[PDB]
Amino acid sequence: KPRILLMGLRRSGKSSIQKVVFHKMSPNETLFLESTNKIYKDDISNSSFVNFQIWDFPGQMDFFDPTFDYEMIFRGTGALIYVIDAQDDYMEALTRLHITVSKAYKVNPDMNFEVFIHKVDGLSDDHKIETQRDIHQRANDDLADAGLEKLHLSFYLTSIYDHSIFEAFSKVVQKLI
Amino acid sequence: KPRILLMGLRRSGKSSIQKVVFHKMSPNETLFLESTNKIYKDDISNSSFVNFQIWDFPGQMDFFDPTFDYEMIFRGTGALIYVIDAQDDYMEALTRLHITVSKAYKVNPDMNFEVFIHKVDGLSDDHKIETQRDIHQRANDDLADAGLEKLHLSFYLTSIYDHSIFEAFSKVVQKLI
Amino acid sequence: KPRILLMGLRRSGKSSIQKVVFHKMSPNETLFLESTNKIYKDDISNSSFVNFQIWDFPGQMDFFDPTFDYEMIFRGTGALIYVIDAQDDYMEALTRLHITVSKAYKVNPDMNFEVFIHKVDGLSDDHKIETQRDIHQRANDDLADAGLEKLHLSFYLTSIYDHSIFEAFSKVVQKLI
Amino acid sequence: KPRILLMGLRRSGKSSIQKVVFHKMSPNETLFLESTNKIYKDDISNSSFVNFQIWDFPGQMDFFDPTFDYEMIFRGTGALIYVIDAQDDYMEALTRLHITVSKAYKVNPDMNFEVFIHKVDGLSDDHKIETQRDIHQRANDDLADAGLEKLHLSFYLTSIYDHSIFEAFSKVVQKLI
Ligand SMILES: Nc1nc2c(ncn2[C@@H]2O[C@H](COP(=O)(O)OP(=O)(O)NP(=O)(O)O)[C@@H](O)[C@H]2O)c(=O)[nH]1
Ligand SMILES: Nc1nc2c(ncn2[C@@H]2O[C@H](COP(=O)(O)OP(=O)(O)NP(=O)(O)O)[C@@H](O)[C@H]2O)c(=O)[nH]1
Ligand SMILES: Nc1nc2c(ncn2[C@@H]2O[C@H](COP(=O)(O)OP(=O)(O)NP(=O)(O)O)[C@@H](O)[C@H]2O)c(=O)[nH]1
Ligand SMILES: Nc1nc2c(ncn2[C@@H]2O[C@H](COP(=O)(O)OP(=O)(O)NP(=O)(O)O)[C@@H](O)[C@H]2O)c(=O)[nH]1
Ligand SMILES: [Mg+2]
Ligand SMILES: [Mg+2]
Ligand SMILES: [Mg+2]
Ligand SMILES: [Mg+2]
């Protein structure tokens, strides 16, 4: 069944997203989530829903940890959602995005890359658009510099406090089935 | 006990309607519903509610599939709700509506025919009214051409994102008890 | 423990009130409630809540049914909530209110009489006030004519679609503890 | 694991806060909470949340009751949340706040003192600010008079009817981990 990864720096909102979208958590409650220290493999198995697996990662996985066979993980992955906290400085997020998608694409160029520009409830509508544009351009420029123009990133403006996170996650799922 | 069918093209919103109205699903969650591949017979049995059965059909049932005795099904049916996605082109929906209600009426002319012009949260109020008028007129004209003027269609403007789907489904139930 | 009765004509909203306030029912779902045909004794027993019993009656109890010892019921009752559908004609409701409270007061003049002018979500704010005034004056005039000036009615404007039903029911409970 | 106390006069909203934030209670339902007569020790233990213990106290603990070793309790306490009903007169609340934090600080000067100026949904925004200022100044002046300038109070404007209670409680938790 399709496997979707949730990756991104600590505090970007990965666990909140899976809890709100798939486990009926109120967004307000997500403030009390513990920081994630083990990969959590969430089987969306209910007989009425599309069936797929979501892997909620600890933020900022260490690609040098020999416990983690990232190549094997990526070869079995249909989509990688990279979550960026739009309310915070995102230069490190952009660096880690690049490292992550370049490693994934090299082993599975059929993977879909989905960038959630997240926590946008804290931004004005115009600033959401400017933030997406800056992220889009910087991320694509980094890809171009590395000879990875053919690696396509899709961008989404998301918040757990409205419909947008559900719409975004649904678009990601629908591409895989 | 009364039997109500949910029919309509794939993606019209049948399963969403039954989940939101009768199973406490958030409308946002319905984005992740699987396409329905078997008739689901939902017994509304709770001791505090009106008791009736809802049959959630796969979209666009094949009237030529010999596994399905539609005449027998219709003879035991009190109401047929035909769901139309108002945000999409509805010419095929209108064709299939006509085929469906004409077949049902021929075996059970006491059946109530209930047309949910659905997903109206994506329409302006004026466009909702124009869409209902166009559907109403086209559907009635098709009935007239087939000599089925006495077959009455009732029309409802519905969305899972507000009270309207509950109000509509309640009106359908109340007519049967 | 305190006993509170819910009485009123059929369809006034008695069962909706108890379901929404004490059983987490969405107001939208109450459209599908069956008409009540037996007294339902609801023990509010949760260890965190005030403990009391709510008796949800069939609408328009028959005072002439010899199965029902209304005097005994009233002698054990702390408050009687009489629910009136504000969206409907309320002349019969006023007649039945009078009959009900006069019978109750005669056996238990310590009972509290609480009139919920209900379903006010369908009224303008000014019309809510005029409706309460008309009900208040008519009900008190009927009491005066019967020599029951000392029987006090309290009036509340309520809806299951907002905080008002909770506020009203809380006021009734607080008077008893 | 961190221990957080909820203290404050009766009816200030302590139990409502813990129920709404940590037990999915609707704010409307909190109207029916019983007055608390025993300390309730609530272990926030879910494997996805920060793990800590909340002690919901009866309002206005009696420091002279020999059943209660307040010094021992305070020595094991990371934060003390003192809840003040902003809609009510708060002179007694301020007196009891002072007594409480001075006793706590004397045995555990590392404790965090968190004052929730609560029920602010009943105040205008400007009156919220003036109420916080008056409470802040009066509380600090009392500390200064007692030679307790180094005892720091943090102030929060909270309501169970919006995000503010969640935000406030989250800030308190985050300071402890
Ligand atoms: N304003 C706002 N805050 C959000 C949003 N999504 C998550 N948060 C907040 O962001 C914080 C961190 O969320 P969390 O899901 O734990 O992040 P994470 O990416 O799983 N962290 P880790 O990698 O350490 O496990 C929480 O306080 C949460 O409520 C959002 O859309 N808007
Ligand atoms: N905007 C909007 N979308 C809706 C509404 N009702 C359903 N949807 C969406 O329509 C899509 C299809 O819904 P679904 O209930 O699976 O349709 P179905 O008619 O059961 N399909 P099938 O016949 O294949 O089983 C979902 O993404 C769902 O969220 C509505 O009122 N508004
Ligand atoms: N608009 C609106 N409708 C309401 C309100 N309360 C209840 N209703 C509706 O009124 C109808 C009847 O409700 P119900 O609770 O069954 O009434 P009842 O007084 O228990 N009837 P019976 O005496 O026959 O058992 C339902 O369709 C319900 O949704 C309200 O505050 N506003
Ligand atoms: N308007 C409003 N009312 C609130 C708020 N928080 C609590 N309340 C109300 O305040 C009342 C008392 O709440 P409760 O939680 O029992 O208070 P407590 O401090 O635990 N009392 P005790 O010390 O006796 O146990 C309830 O009616 C509750 O609904 C709030 O933010 N706003
Ligand atoms: Mg996490
Ligand atoms: Mg379906
Ligand atoms: Mg009833
Ligand atoms: Mg309490």
Coordinates of C-alpha atoms in Angstrom, one line a residue, chain D residues 26-135:
Chain D
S26 CA -16.9 21.3 25.5
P27 CA -16.7 24.6 27.4
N28 CA -20.5 24.6 27.5
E29 CA -20.6 21.3 29.4
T30 CA -18.4 22.7 32.2
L31 CA -21.4 24.6 33.6
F32 CA -22.4 21.2 35.1
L33 CA -19.2 20.4 36.9
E34 CA -19.5 19.6 40.6
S35 CA -17.5 21.7 43.1
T36 CA -14.3 19.8 43.8
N37 CA -13.9 18.3 47.3
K38 CA -10.8 16.2 47.0
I39 CA -7.5 16.8 45.2
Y40 CA -7.7 15.2 41.8
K41 CA -4.3 14.0 40.5
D42 CA -4.6 13.8 36.7
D43 CA -1.7 12.0 35.0
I44 CA -1.3 13.3 31.5
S45 CA 0.2 9.9 30.3
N46 CA -0.8 9.5 26.7
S47 CA 2.2 8.2 24.8
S48 CA 2.0 11.1 22.3
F49 CA 1.8 14.0 24.8
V50 CA 4.3 15.6 27.1
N51 CA 4.0 13.6 30.3
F52 CA 3.2 15.5 33.5
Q53 CA 0.8 15.5 36.4
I54 CA -1.9 18.1 37.1
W55 CA -3.4 18.4 40.6
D56 CA -6.8 20.0 40.5
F57 CA -7.5 21.4 44.0
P58 CA -10.7 22.2 45.9
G59 CA -11.0 25.9 45.8
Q60 CA -9.5 27.9 48.7
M61 CA -7.5 25.1 50.4
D62 CA -7.4 25.4 54.1
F63 CA -3.7 25.9 55.0
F64 CA -4.7 25.1 58.6
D65 CA -6.2 21.7 57.9
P66 CA -3.6 19.3 59.4
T67 CA -4.5 16.6 56.8
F68 CA -2.5 18.6 54.2
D69 CA 1.3 18.8 54.1
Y70 CA 1.5 21.8 51.8
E71 CA 5.3 22.2 52.3
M72 CA 5.8 18.6 51.0
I73 CA 3.4 19.2 48.1
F74 CA 5.2 22.4 47.1
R75 CA 8.7 20.9 47.3
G76 CA 7.6 18.5 44.6
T77 CA 5.9 21.1 42.5
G78 CA 7.3 22.6 39.3
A79 CA 4.6 25.2 38.6
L80 CA 1.6 26.6 40.5
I81 CA -1.2 28.0 38.3
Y82 CA -3.4 30.4 40.4
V83 CA -6.7 31.0 38.6
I84 CA -8.6 34.3 39.1
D85 CA -12.2 34.9 37.9
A86 CA -11.8 38.2 36.1
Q87 CA -15.6 38.7 36.0
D88 CA -15.8 38.8 39.7
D89 CA -14.4 41.0 42.5
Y90 CA -10.8 39.8 42.9
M91 CA -9.7 41.3 46.2
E92 CA -10.0 38.0 48.0
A93 CA -8.3 36.3 45.1
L94 CA -5.4 38.7 45.4
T95 CA -5.1 38.0 49.2
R96 CA -5.2 34.3 48.7
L97 CA -2.8 34.5 45.8
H98 CA -0.3 36.3 48.0
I99 CA -0.6 33.8 50.9
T100 CA -0.3 30.9 48.5
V101 CA 2.8 32.0 46.5
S102 CA 4.6 33.3 49.6
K103 CA 4.2 29.9 51.3
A104 CA 5.2 28.0 48.1
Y105 CA 8.2 30.2 47.4
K106 CA 9.6 29.9 50.9
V107 CA 10.0 26.1 50.5
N108 CA 10.7 26.0 46.8
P109 CA 12.0 29.2 45.3
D110 CA 12.6 27.4 41.9
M111 CA 8.8 27.0 41.4
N112 CA 7.2 28.9 38.6
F113 CA 4.2 31.1 39.5
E114 CA 1.6 31.4 36.8
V115 CA -1.5 33.6 37.3
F116 CA -4.4 32.9 34.9
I117 CA -6.7 36.0 34.7
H118 CA -9.6 33.8 33.7
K119 CA -13.1 34.0 32.1
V120 CA -12.0 36.9 30.0
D121 CA -14.7 36.1 27.4
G122 CA -16.9 38.3 29.6
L123 CA -14.7 41.4 29.2
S124 CA -13.9 43.9 26.5
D125 CA -10.3 43.8 25.1
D126 CA -9.5 47.1 26.8
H127 CA -10.9 46.0 30.1
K128 CA -8.9 42.8 29.9
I129 CA -5.7 44.9 29.7
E130 CA -6.8 47.2 32.6
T131 CA -7.7 44.1 34.7
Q132 CA -4.3 42.5 34.1
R133 CA -2.6 45.7 34.9
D134 CA -4.4 46.2 38.2
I135 CA -3.9 42.6 39.2

